[PDB]
């Protein structure tokens, strides 16, 4: 072992990014991760599924779950 993390992706407008969140990552954490990927500091994240209109990761219980559940995410400008 050395640093256990999750492999979760995200979608911004028409681009997809990939980030690593440990088994205790918080939303803000998850969000801070997508920011440096996007071109904005005002972006939202949401679990992307068959529909593409899942839940918006704003709370730790989700973002985390996304790292655990390995849930796909979609980030967008706000």
């Amino acid at each position: 072992p050395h640093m256990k993390t999750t492999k979760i992706k995200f979608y911004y407008k028409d681009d997809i990014f990939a980030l690593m969140l440990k088994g205790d990552t918080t939303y803000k954490e998850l969000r801070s991760k997508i920011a440096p990927r996007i071109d904005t500091d005002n972006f939202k994240l949401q679990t992307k599924l068959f529909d593409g209109s899942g839940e918006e990761i704003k709370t730790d219980s989700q973002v985390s779950n996304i790292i655990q559940a390995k849930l796909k995410i979609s980030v967008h400008d706000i």
Binding site: T5, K7, K9, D15, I16, F17, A18, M20, R37, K72
Partner: protein, 86 residues
């Protein structure tokens, strides 16, 4: 030869492979990429996309992601990379 990563890069409707040791950061590999992708005749580029296990294509150009790339690979230790440009 050694434990390096081959950057399978598909720019437009063609494929280019750029080797990048796992010991280097987003630069060298980019420095490597630019060394192989520039042949596309468009621009030296500054960002790359990489196919994830999800079956889609994502981006990569940060220390955080860079670690994900090596690790995402580590899991399978393929020693390659499915990259795409444009």
């Amino acid at each position: 030869p050694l434990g390096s990563i081959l950057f399978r890069i598909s720019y437009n409707s063609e494929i280019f492979t750029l080797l990048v040791e796992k010991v280097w950061n987003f630069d060298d590999l980019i420095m490597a990429i630019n060394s192989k992708i520039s042949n596309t005749h468009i621009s030296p580029i500054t960002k790359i996309k990489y196919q994830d296990e999800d079956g889609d294509f994502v981006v990569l150009g940060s220390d955080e992601d860079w670690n994900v790339a090596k690790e995402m690979l580590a899991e399978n230790n393929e020693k390659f990379l499915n990259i795409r440009l444009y």
